[PDB]
Design a protein around this ligand. Structure first.
Ligand SMILES: CCc1ccccc1-c1ccc(CNCCc2nc3cc(Cl)ccc3[nH]2)cc1Cl
Ligand SMILES: CCc1ccccc1-c1ccc(CNCCc2nc3cc(Cl)ccc3[nH]2)cc1Cl
Lengths: 324, 327
């Protein structure tokens, strides 16, 4: 395939010492978990359990994430990234790194976030609220991309919101990676509905622009009240669902531009599809959230060609955000 | 009717509240891997029933440290392994990477993370007041952590502290004499190296605790800020208490033994004598005055005390004004 590189923050890691990005060589110091009293289970994920806890030294509430150590290199990667981004705008704050004396199970301690339910806001959210919170996500993405990091798992489950205080945090940095120009990455990242075209066609030389496709999927689902926007049933079908909206013409233009060999599994399922107008998704239930500015912005995010999508900085300058 | 009992002021019941698997090292099952993955390079040092080597892990081309143990006491090897496994990953603690045996010899061997030791015999004269505060704080991080984990090191001395000065990295090593703290337990007093033994060991007071490590740390601090190695230069264990008494005085020694109803060995009768309490300022001279300050002397005074209960804990020591200049 034809090589590719990011249009922004291309050489940020190349210009820093190896200590910043060589996570494998990073020395992790595990403190004593006895300073934290577990209160209640908040959620259960893939190789992780989240708990609400109390720090007994200062009587403050914290969040404790207990990791099933299936991959040690992956735990080192998440810790180094969290340490580098610690304190950044709208990034979850790593407070401590601990192990229980008996179990020796790796655990990460974070700042407490008093989140509001996603299925509860849905009925009361205004056009302004969507513009406001989309801008808050963009602050986190322009910051982490400027720090040479791609999140690679942007989705509503990884965005915590405290609506009362109008506070947002981007969480779960377990799939994040350091961007190095010309590097070939694993395509088995992100969650099915938010996976970019480059991942589905096995194009390994991707960048920060992957996060911008995922952000576009979130915006489309919110403005149109259609969750998920691109509803695939497997990784191959996921590309077909995008092809039903963006057309089969631009998909071949994209694969030819980068000389990508299309998997034989796509032969009987891809078919032929026309490029659809964004206004076809407007209905009585969602029209109070749709506008010409919102549709122009969405159109610039959901594009097959990763190089053509708006960067997080370019997105922040769009007329959709003139009111925030 | 015997000596008065004593207990630690901090982390008193940390092992009492944990299941037996954590602290019952005798019942611990050790799995010995194959030493063929490691190629020995050169000898680094030779100790009592142990030889330390620089080695290469042939699977990833990385340098490691291999400690080969002469198996004179099996229970002691199990104790060191369980303690190293419990503290694995803690701040400034040497990291146990593997536990192996050579196929032919079957000699027990421990594999650790690599530490590139700076030779301090020449950089001893380049050390600043800030450097001593910095490295003393690094040792305190290791001690507050191991004490919080219910473990006493019992052999704190310069030989058991490795420093990579270029990267400002410090590690506390050789956990072969370490033990689990249980309140009211009577321990063997034949621990630590002569110059670093606390008065509790010298007067045969067995119910000691984490505070023993704080005396040893005080001996290291005094030898550094005064450029006097060792600070308390005894020729045997009885003479070692006499060297301490020539500095702290004999009045406070009698107050200590009376507090705990300690019976002083008859061997001290003709050698102890009578000694005044010396001011710490008397040890200041032209060659060491650049390392001494009122804050350094107040901190030292609060570690080098006969009464083990009166000494600062590692956490209390970290809050002293001597460390106000360090991160
Ligand atoms: C109007 C914001 C918005 C704009 C566009 C697209 C989507 C959104 C949106 C909607 C909902 C959410 C909230 N999602 C919470 C996920 C979550 N993760 C959790 C983990 C735990 Cl352990 C416990 C509780 C947790 N809760 C966020 C956004 Cl950005
Ligand atoms: C300014 C640090 C400090 C402050 C106060 C008091 C003392 C010190 C201090 C000074 C020097 C050292 C160096 N210690 C190395 C011992 C050592 N042990 C080794 C074992 C082997 Cl196998 C091979 C090589 C080894 N080398 C440490 C301290 Cl804490």
């Amino acid at each position: 395939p034809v090589p590719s590189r990011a249009r922004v923050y291309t050489d940020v890691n190349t210009h820093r010492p190896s200590e910043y990005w060589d996570y494998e060589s990073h020395v992790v110091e595990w403190g004593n978990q006895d300073d934290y009293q577990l209160v209640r289970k908040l959620g259960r994920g893939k190789y992780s359990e989240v708990f609400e806890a109390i720090n007994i030294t200062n009587n403050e509430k914290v969040v404790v994430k207990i990791l099933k150590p299936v991959k040690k290199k992956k735990i080192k990667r998440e810790i180094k990234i969290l340490e580098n981004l610690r304190g950044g705008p709208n990034i979850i704050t790593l407070a401590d790194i601990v192990k229980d004396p008996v179990s020796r199970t790796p655990a990460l301690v974070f700042e407490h976030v008093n989140n509001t339910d996603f299925k509860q806001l849905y009925q009361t959210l205004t056009d302004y609220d969507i513009r406001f919170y989309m801008y808050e996500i963009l602050k986190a993405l322009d910051y982490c991309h400027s720090m040479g990091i791609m999140h690679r798992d942007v989705k509503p489950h990884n965005v915590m919101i405290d609506h009362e205080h109008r506070k947002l945090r981007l969480i779960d940095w377990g799939l994040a990676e350091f961007y190095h120009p010309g590097q070939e990455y694993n395509v088995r990242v992100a969650s099915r509905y938010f996976k970019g075209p480059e991942l589905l066609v096995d194009y390994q030389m991707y960048d920060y622009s992957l996060d911008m496709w995922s952000l576009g999927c979130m915006l489309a689902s919110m403005i149109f009240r259609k969750e998920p926007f691109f509803h695939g049933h497997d990784n191959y079908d996921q590309l077909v669902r995008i092809a039903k909206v963006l057309g089969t013409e631009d998909l071949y233009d994209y694969i030819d531009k980068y000389n990508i060999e299309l998997d034989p599994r796509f032969n009987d399922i891809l078919g032929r599809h026309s490029r659809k107008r964004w206004e076809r998704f407007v209905h009585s239930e969602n029209q109070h959230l749709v506008s010409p500015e919102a549709l122009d912005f969405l159109d610039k995010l959901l594009r097959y060609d990763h190089q053509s999508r708006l960067t997080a900085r370019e997105a922040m300058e769009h007329p959709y955000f003139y009111t925030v």
